[PDB]
Each structure stands twice: as C-alpha cells, then as structure tokens.
Amino acid sequence: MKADAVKIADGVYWVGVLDWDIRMYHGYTLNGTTYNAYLVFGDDKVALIDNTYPGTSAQMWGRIKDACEKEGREFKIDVIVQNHVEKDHSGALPEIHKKFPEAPIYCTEVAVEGLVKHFPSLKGAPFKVVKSLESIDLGGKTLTFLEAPLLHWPDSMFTLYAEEGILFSNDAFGQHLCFTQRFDHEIPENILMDANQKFYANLITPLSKLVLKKFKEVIELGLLEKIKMIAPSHGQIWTDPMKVIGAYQDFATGKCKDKVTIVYDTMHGSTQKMAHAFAEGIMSEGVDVKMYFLHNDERSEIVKDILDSKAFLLGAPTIYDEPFPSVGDLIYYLKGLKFNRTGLKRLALAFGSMGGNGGGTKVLAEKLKECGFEVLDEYELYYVPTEDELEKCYNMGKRLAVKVKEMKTE
C-alpha cells in the first residue's frame, strides 16, 4: 500500500504504523495506537529502528519506500536495530531479514534468544549483540546504545542518534494514541498527559525504582542534556523531553493530588449507595473523587486514576462468604503493579453490604494491605443502608479526606 513517511529531522523519518482500529492490548483499553519505527539515512548506511506488529507491515513498507525515494536512495536497509523483542515492535523482523538478509540486527544479548523463540526463521540471522555506550557509525550519523533491562522487559534498550539528540526509547515514554499528528505539541496537552499517565500506571508502576535508577545513570553519564527529542515506540514524539521525564519523576516518587479513587461492585445497589455516600463526605472537604463501577468499568482506567490519588476505596457485597468476584481481577492487577514501589503507601478503606455472616470487607482489607495500601478502616452493614448508616459513610469519607490533605505531597 502507498503510505507517506514523516520527516522528523534531516535524514530521519517516522516509518511507523497507525493501528486505527485496535481497542485492547495487554490488560488495557485504548482507541487505537501506533507502532513507531524510524529510518535513519547516514551517508553510508540506512538504519531501521524497530518495526511493527505481525500482519501490519503494509504501512511500514510503504513509508520506507517513500522515504528512500525522497532521499533519492535505493529501497534498501543496511542496518536493523531491535530495541525490544515484544511483537508489537519486532513482528516484522522476519520479513525485514528475508528482504535484507545481510543487514546486521543490533539488539541486547538476551534479546537474541527471545527473538529466535518468537520467530524461528531468524535462527542464523546476523545478530550483533550490543552493550551500553557502544556506537555504530552510519556516515555522518551515530547511533549509541543504552541498555534498559526491565524497562519494560529484560531485553529492552534505548538507541540515541547523537548528532540531533533523538532518543529512540521504545516503550518508555510512549502513549497509546493514534493521531495523524506525530508530535507532542500538535495535540491537546490534556490528552497527551492523560495518556502518558495511563501508560505509566499500567506498564511502568512496578518499575518505578528502576526508573529512578536509570534517571540517575543518565544524569551522571551527562546524557540528559544531550537528549533533545524522545521518539518512543507508541504515540507522540516528545519535542519537549523534560516534560515527560518530569512526569515519570513525579509518578515514580509518589507525587499525588488531593484525590480519592472509589471502586465498587454491587448486585442489589446497597454497596453502590455506600460508595456514593463516601464520596459526598470526601467532597465536603474539597477533595476530588473518581467513581468506578466494576460492572461497567475496567482495570486500566482505574489504575490510571489510582496513580495520582492519595487514597483508594474498594467495596463489594459478600457472596457465599467472599467478596463479589469482580474485585479479584483488580486485586490481581494491583498485586502485579505494586503501587507502593512509587514510595507512597496510599490510604484505603474497605466497605460493603452483607446479608448473613458477612466477611467480604475483611477479605478486601487483607488484600488492600497485600497490595501496598494503608487500610485505615472497614465498614460492613446489613442489606440496605439506613439514613444514619449513609451518614456514617459520609463521616468516614470526610475524616479520610482530612487525612488526605494532611499527607505531604511527595
């Protein structure tokens, strides 16, 4: 298919793929995304940095062809860089190798085995293992590699185009957005940063300590000031790299708002009434509230709002001695994300209605603790809340909101 490349610097093009139609990936929702791949034209060698998901290469090849024509060059790739083995960025590597079998493939040591396990036709491909601070010369353009294990896979690495300071960061600093506009400043800031927050919350939270360590290494290497553009593998290219670095710094150190995220499920509406009553009390103190109903809403938006919330409420009715099962999905997600690794133990309350022996709230409190929250109280009641019982929820919310505002903003 015919598809035009987008120039991002002299001799550097975006040749990625617009996945207009995807609505879910990993455990998170979205309204399309991109698989960003880049073509760098040196005097001697043309380098392709990352590629795209299996079966979506038609756009990529069209843009690569378009870029070579604009450069007056043959349709030829001399160098292949694979920052990350996950298949939304490597899925076309077998195609690329089959068309250019002599082009070396630069990747990390553990990436070789991962790529071969994904794509057995790559066994015997000219892999060239790289380590941090190693560089290849393309002819007037230099690519420098920086290893980034567990950011977000063991195989991950960054590639820096030194002369213009363009950091190809793969997933790091990406956002799941699919626009015709390619750069951060070309879309509304609120959309950009909300998507950055969702991306961090769902993929980077458990790596928060590795983020700070990598930031400390980049600073001591003197490399931070040499980064003028961050070109991630999903979403917008950052012409303001410090904006997203500052965001990651905030998220990794627990900088939160006077904000509470309330999550609940219900069968007959009683736990829902309690959840709304807790919100009224919280709002009476000027503290913000996000309200999620697990019947309708899903984990990826919930954890987005938890990321900059100082407190997290979870409620569910008791059903055969256990909390309603929908909470198990979120709890298992929170056990993997480990929000306590941001440096903050967010406050929490457990609540629900019951009709017999109860116990669901007890379980929720235990799980909220296993997930790294500081549970301050529990409240379980019988069937439909009375007027006074909703006032108790209001009072509990108010007291929580007071504590939220006294917690110092990290």
Ligand X SMILES: Cc1cc2nc3c(=O)[nH]c(=O)nc-3n(C[C@H](O)[C@H](O)[C@H](O)COP(=O)(O)O)c2cc1C
15 touches its own copies (CB under 8 A): no
Q: Which is nearer to its own copies, 1 or 124 (CB)?
A: 1
Q: How many residues bind ligand X (CB under 6 A)?
A: 2
Binding flags for its own copies, 168-187, as an x/- string (CB under 8 A): ----------x-xx------
Query: Does 66 count as an annotated binding residue?
Result: no
Binding flags for Fe ion, 48-87, as an x/- string (CB under 5 A): --------------------------------------x-
225 Cβ partners below 8 Å, 6+ apart?
Answer: none
Please answer whether residues 258 and 286 qualify as being in contact, where contact means their C-beta atoms are separated by less than 8 angstroms: yes
Please answer whether residues 18 and 11 qualify as being in contact, where contact means their C-beta atoms are separated by less than 8 angstroms: no
Question: CB neighbours (10 Å) of residue 255?
Answer: 17
- 259 vs 288: CA distance, rounded Å: 4
Which one among 21, 102, 225, 406 touches its own copies, defined by CB under 8 A? 21
3 touches its own copies (CB under 8 A): yes
Q: Which is nearer to ligand X, 325 or 336 (CB)?
A: 336
Residue 2's binding partner among Fe ion, its own copies, ligand X, none (Cβ under 5 to 8 angstroms by kind) is: its own copies
26 touches ligand X (CB under 6 A): yes
404 Cβ partners below 8 Å, 6+ apart?
Answer: 258, 259, 260, 282, 285, 287, 310, 311, 347
1 touches its own copies (CB under 8 A): yes
281 touches its own copies (CB under 8 A): yes
Q: Which is nearer to its own copies, 135 or 284 (CB)?
A: 284
Question: CB neighbours (10 Å) of residue 359?
Answer: 15
59 touches its own copies (CB under 8 A): yes
23 Cβ partners below 8 Å, 6+ apart?
Answer: 29, 30, 31, 32
Residue 171's binding partner among its own copies, Fe ion, ligand X, none (Cβ under 5 to 8 angstroms by kind) is: Fe ion
- 346 vs 335: CA distance, rounded Å: 14
SS3 at position 87: helix
Question: CB neighbours (10 Å) of residue 274?
Answer: 30
Which one among 50, 66, 88, 147 touches Fe ion, defined by CB under 5 A? 88
**Residue 33 belongs to what H/E stretch?**
strand 33-35
85 touches ligand X (CB under 6 A): no
**Residue 79 belongs to what H/E stretch?**
strand 79-81
Residue 386's binding partner among its own copies, ligand X, Fe ion, none (Cβ under 5 to 8 angstroms by kind) is: none
Tokens of 354: 């019951």
Look up residue 384 and give its amino acid.
V
Please answer whether residues 66 and 4 qualify as being in contact, where contact means their C-beta atoms are separated by less than 8 angstroms: yes
| CA dihedral sign of residues 231, 111, 92, 248 | negative
- 243 vs 175: CA distance, rounded Å: 14
Q: How many residues bind its own copies (CB under 8 A)?
A: 37
Question: How far from 220 is each of 163, 170, 214, CA to CA, in Å?
Answer: 20, 22, 10
263 touches its own copies (CB under 8 A): no
SS3 at position 25: strand
289 touches its own copies (CB under 8 A): yes
Choose one: 16-24, 94-102, 342-350, 372-380; the region binding its own copies (CB under 8 A). Answer: 16-24
Please answer whether residues 351 and 274 qualify as being in contact, where contact means their C-beta atoms are separated by less than 8 angstroms: yes
131 touches ligand X (CB under 6 A): no
Binding flags for ligand X, 170-209, as an x/- string (CB under 6 A): ---------------------------------x------
- 268 vs 102: CA distance, rounded Å: 65
Please answer whether residues 60 and 15 qualify as being in contact, where contact means their C-beta atoms are separated by less than 8 angstroms: yes
Query: Does 52 count as an annotated binding residue?
Result: no
Residue 203's binding partner among Fe ion, ligand X, its own copies, none (Cβ under 5 to 8 angstroms by kind) is: ligand X
Q: Which is nearer to its own copies, 179 or 332 (CB)?
A: 179
Look up residue 405 and give its amino acid.
K
394 touches its own copies (CB under 8 A): yes
Q: What is the binding site for ligand X (CB under 6 A)?
A: 26, 203
Binding site: residue ranges? 10, 44, 84, 86, 88-89, 113, 152, 171, 217, 234, 266-268, 270-271, 297, 318, 320-321, 353-356, 358, 378
Annotated binding site for Fe(3+): which residue ranges? 84, 86, 88-89, 152, 171, 234
Residues in contact with its own copies by the rule CB under 8 A: 1-4, 18, 20-21, 23, 32, 58-59, 62, 178, 180-181, 188-191, 272-273, 276-277, 279-281, 283-284, 288-289, 291, 293, 296, 387, 390-391, 394
